Symmetry: C3
Subunit: 153 residues, 3 copies
Amino acid sequence: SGLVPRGSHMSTTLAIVRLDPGLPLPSRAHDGDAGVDLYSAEDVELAPGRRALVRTGVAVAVPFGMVGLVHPRSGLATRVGLSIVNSPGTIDAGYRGEIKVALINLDPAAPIVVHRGDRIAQLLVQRVELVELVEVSSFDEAGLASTSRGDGG
Amino acid sequence: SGLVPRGSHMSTTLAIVRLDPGLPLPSRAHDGDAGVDLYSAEDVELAPGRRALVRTGVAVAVPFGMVGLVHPRSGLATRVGLSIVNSPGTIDAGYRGEIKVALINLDPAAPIVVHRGDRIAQLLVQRVELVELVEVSSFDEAGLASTSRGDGG
Amino acid sequence: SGLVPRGSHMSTTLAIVRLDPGLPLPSRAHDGDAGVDLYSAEDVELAPGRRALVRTGVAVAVPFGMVGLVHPRSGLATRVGLSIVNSPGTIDAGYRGEIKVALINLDPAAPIVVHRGDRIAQLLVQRVELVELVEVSSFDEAGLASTSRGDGG
Ligand SMILES: O=c1ccn([C@H]2C[C@H](O)[C@@H](COP(=O)(O)NP(=O)(O)OP(=O)(O)O)O2)c(=O)[nH]1
Ligand SMILES: O=c1ccn([C@H]2C[C@H](O)[C@@H](COP(=O)(O)NP(=O)(O)OP(=O)(O)O)O2)c(=O)[nH]1
Ligand SMILES: O=c1ccn([C@H]2C[C@H](O)[C@@H](COP(=O)(O)NP(=O)(O)OP(=O)(O)O)O2)c(=O)[nH]1
Ligand SMILES: [Mg+2]
Ligand SMILES: [Mg+2]
Ligand SMILES: [Mg+2]
């Protein structure tokens, strides 16, 4: 329906330009899914170990105070070793260019064929803290020293 | 204590089924830690460059409006080159199956042995924006054109 | 200005120690950007397939209820195959040590040279749900069974 539901009265609008209108709008595969699936605008073959920067045919306007995040899909990751070099890719609120996906073939022997119209990644949108750094001479200064860890990870 | 603290009165409940009750419940290694560590239910050896889909023995119910995120652990990543092909793995609110982790050995020469009961990943839970896409013919239309970047990244 | 703006009255402070004060404070490359870029404190050469744990010269105090996330930069990922083994790296609220970045060269043939003072990663800060796990015998118990997916992903 065109009626915005009760709880979800503050659902976030994402403006999108289909730079390649031959591709469907990105969509959630199932209700409640965190991401919308991005399509490839191109046919690409990746030999083992090779990477490509693949156009998705879309540009978005992530709201200020938020971030878009490009995540790999789990099925292709396991079945053929498809990954994303810079995962999770960070799409900034001021970016108005085309979203591109840095696919890489992490299989040792079998090439990966991507066809135009395949779903090759997923886009999440989340709030981000735009932090103000405060340089301190030590954490005790800031009142932040004794912790559950310390300088240990 | 069983008393929910002052500030943290709205702590998020995560329902979990131990499909493999021989494994401990996932836990935070230290107070304030972002994730709970996931266990492997199986023994697995990964030769250099090989990947596996590893059962964790748990199923969860991420709340609607949230997402579960499967992240690698830093120590194994550096010491032996252990990574996750689809990192960060995206666990959707409607998913009720077993959480699986797509481990991969990014070392060139040394095999990685995973034992049942090892902590092989960490699970974070975060809010996500379930966005409504609005297709526009250009960002100016939406009142969103002139930015700190432009189509540049 | 020193005046905190209207909307952004609740901007998050991140205390930071420059363990290596010869490096600039991390900064956002453009307004609205989700992350601040982390510098390398060292010169490092990565042969194809090799990884290193690289010091960034900073320690931070992520607030309780938040997480720091270390993400790769897209340009180096595509141009030279630079990635991060444990991406996204998880920086916990109680951590007070130096932030380190697990760089890896995913190119098959060309070495990557990192110079002291190069920007080698980006740090985001986000809220995280510090969840309370509730073990249930099945999701129906919790009132959470019938979904848009089921045990299917
Ligand atoms: O990219 C990273 C990730 C982690 N770290 C630090 C901060 C984090 O709080 C700490 C622990 O991270 P992990 O939980 O990913 N590592 P692991 O589980 O191996 O070790 P620990 O026992 O300390 O949790 O390591 C970094 O410096 N860089
Ligand atoms: O997966 C991605 C990541 C980034 N991008 C675009 C959007 C983002 O806002 C822009 C910059 O991303 P990075 O900061 O990760 N890249 P880098 O730091 O190399 O370049 P810049 O100088 O533009 O920040 O690149 C994509 O199209 N796909
Ligand atoms: O690391 C992960 C990622 C996903 N999953 C499960 C939960 C998630 O909700 C489900 C689907 O994840 P993806 O969307 O990344 N996979 P894909 O798009 O290939 O399949 P689907 O058609 O089910 O969306 O797979 C895991 O068990 N581990
Ligand atoms: Mg999917
Ligand atoms: Mg840990
Ligand atoms: Mg950048």
